[PDB]
Design a protein around this ligand. Structure first.
Ligand SMILES: Cc1ccccc1-n1c(=O)c2c(C)c(C(=O)C3=C(O)CCCC3=O)ccc2n(C)c1=O
Ligand SMILES: Cc1ccccc1-n1c(=O)c2c(C)c(C(=O)C3=C(O)CCCC3=O)ccc2n(C)c1=O
Ligand SMILES: [Co+2]
Ligand SMILES: [Co+2]
Lengths: 379, 379
């Protein structure tokens, strides 16, 4: 059941912003590892004396990488005269975030009909304000409220290309990489206590809840279920230590756990990413045993052929199934030094009407299926 | 004239250590951009709860990338019980360095006969101590003194594979990249005042001085002139603003300006690096006008053929000449967000006896030749 209770009009995920120590090196690594194109910049070469921000795109997916310059370059500025293109940016906040958490997501940005309205309604309904609405060049409005930990939910609305003050990058420096990633499917937070986190976020958004090893989790969703925000809490005392708890320890508390990126062809995406794992790209979790793929015939043999299943086996892809649809997924190793944030690659099969959001679930059935396949492979 | 006045026995450059916010992403970017192999690690997976350190190698060149973990992971440790593999590391120093300077070189490390002796003699002769000698697993001794700004000169000596506590990286995660880079030729500092900097460093090392647009510079060299440490100061009031002064402003003071990496085949190195510039690697300075390469015939037509000169032209390579030998060189754009540190690729022709250090100079003749070629190309 979907009560469609959004307190303001939400459209889609807009962008994800990483706060970095050096935006250049993270953005170049991610571009190569994920097959994302450099598409916009705001830095010294565009007159920004405050922060360096670089935008990567793949389809509708937008990854922004931002780092602070020396405060000395902008010491004469005040907020009315700022050269920052993202007015919510603050040197001290950014340095403290990265010191505390390491490389990670600062902002989960969603496009809304009216960012000022979304902000006011959010705070009237319990949201902790982070940055008030600011209109950029009379064209785009941006506002921020706290989501969890030091992560903000950023509202963006357009009257009528990324943000004012960003320049399109020169074609020569913009190599058209593309491994098939097309949009952000969901963005997942880890928190110490799920209940209060859910109550807080669902409280100010009106997002509704969507449809024994490590965690409890729930998913908040917008009206059409295209903005999907799962949240995890640890389960303590378990045989193996909870990966949610490890996250909280190494991250210094709550924050974004993983970004799930939808591919239009997960087999091409994983072939291309795995070719680059050892030459600057991303590594993937250790593959499941062959028993997992043997057992896929009984589970999804009506959705995937033998060839398509064998192709899952060579690439380490996981498969889970809903009552609505089927999900192919795989997880990277952590994106940076700490065992904190990672990426999921996903493709969904079914739920055609366009495809409805969350088709096939989030792979929670793969916890049981993995452990069983582990012991079954012990044989 | 070479008075051979080293106050202790110096062998060769050993490694360069970058202090990072996220060592993983910088190391992966550099590995791909420069064709360096992942060869050792010290991080959580090796029991280091303090810092993440990753070592890249190409020939004898060793680049180390280090970033701090949360201090909470090691809060119970004291120096006698540390899990850090580099005992001079300090969370606060590293965070303050990166906050102040951004991504850059913390340590210029040279191998010496006896790091304890080198340290004591250095400080007895004016060196400002940074980290006292520490013996690692009764096998390697490390000590540090201040060089300039927040850069240290690190002494390493071996009784008899990088450092104790570092593990060799798994072959699968160790792709054998190689674009021809073979060793560190020289490491260059920018300072506000050259005289005091030279007096200080030559004072404690016994290094001797080796053989109108922007700077004054001089080069300190070890006995056999294989450890080469140029230092630049700005020249103010010039028509174009000094790039040394821009460095000091954006770096928050003195620091390492560039690393010159010798290639065994500069044409292969530059072909391979330029193929990767727009897909995660490094960008190069804008190429000289065709007049520069037209004028190369008269200057080096006895060293390079027409084909070898035309090959310089397509790759943007610069050529300068000594009375001893000839130098091919090219400069990258800055390695990170700030217009501070960059890399030079070099290959030297001549001075055979082995090749003697500094053969061909450092390209200072290319300041005049570039400006002339600029106006000549205006035509
Ligand atoms: C537990 C674990 C340890 C070491 C590496 C990997 C894992 N690991 C996962 O992290 C994992 C995740 C993260 C999801 C997942 O995407 C997801 C949930 O965890 C909760 C609902 C929302 C959501 O999107 C699904 C299955 C997973 N499975 C099966 C798994 O094994
Ligand atoms: C001035 C400038 C502005 C924008 C980009 C590039 C440049 N630029 C250089 O940075 C440059 C350098 C850095 C060297 C060089 O390697 C060097 C010295 O500068 C002093 C002696 C020790 C040493 O190693 C030589 C020639 C150079 N030339 C010719 C040049 O044009
Ligand atoms: Co997921
Ligand atoms: Co040089």
């Amino acid at each position: 059941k979907n009560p469609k209770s959004d307190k303001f009009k939400v459209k889609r995920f807009h962008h994800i912003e990483f706060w970095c120590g050096d935006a250049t090196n993270v953005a170049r690594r991610f571009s190569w590892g994920l097959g994302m194109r450099f598409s916009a910049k705001s830095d010294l070469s565009t007159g920004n004396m405050v922060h360096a921000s670089y935008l990567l795109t793949s389809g509708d997916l937008r990854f922004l990488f931002t780092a602070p310059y020396s405060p000395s370059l902008s010491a004469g500025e005040i907020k009315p005269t700022t050269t920052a293109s993202i007015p919510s940016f603050d040197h001290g906040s950014c340095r403290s975030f990265f010191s505390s958490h390491g490389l990670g997501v600062r902002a989960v940005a969603i496009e809304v009909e009216d960012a000022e309205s979304a902000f006011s309604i959010s705070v009237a309904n319990g949201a902790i304000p982070s940055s008030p609405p600011i209109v950029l060049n009379e064209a785009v409005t941006i506002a921020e409220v706290k989501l969890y930990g030091d992560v903000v939910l950023r509202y963006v609305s357009y009257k009528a290309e990324f943000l004012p003050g960003f320049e399109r990058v020169e074609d020569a420096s913009s190599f058209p990489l593309d491994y098939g990633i097309r949009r952000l499917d969901h963005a997942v937070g880890n928190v110490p206590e799920l209940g209060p986190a859910l109550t807080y976020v669902a409280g100010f958004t009106g997002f509704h809840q969507f449809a024994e090893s490590g965690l409890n989790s729930a998913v908040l969703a917008s009206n059409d279920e295209m903005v999907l925000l799962p949240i995890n809490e640890p389960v303590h005392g378990t045989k193996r230590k909870s990966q949610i708890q490890t996250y909280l320890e190494h991250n210094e508390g709550a924050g974004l756990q993983h970004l799930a990126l939808m591919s239009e062809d997960i087999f091409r995406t994983l072939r291309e990413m795995r070719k680059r794992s050892s030459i600057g790209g991303f590594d993937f979790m250790p593959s499941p045993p062959p028993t997992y793929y043997q057992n896929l015939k009984k589970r999804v043999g009506d959705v995937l052929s033998d060839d398509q299943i064998k192709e899952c086996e060579e690439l380490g892809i996981l498969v889970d199934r809903d009552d609505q649809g089927t999900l192919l997924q795989i997880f990277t190793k952590p994106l940076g030094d700490r065992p904190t944030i990672f990426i999921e690659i996903i493709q969904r099969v079914g739920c055609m009407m366009y495809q409805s959001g969350g088709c096939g679930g989030y792979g929670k059935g793969n916890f049981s299926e993995l452990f069983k396949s582990i012991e079954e492979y012990e044989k």
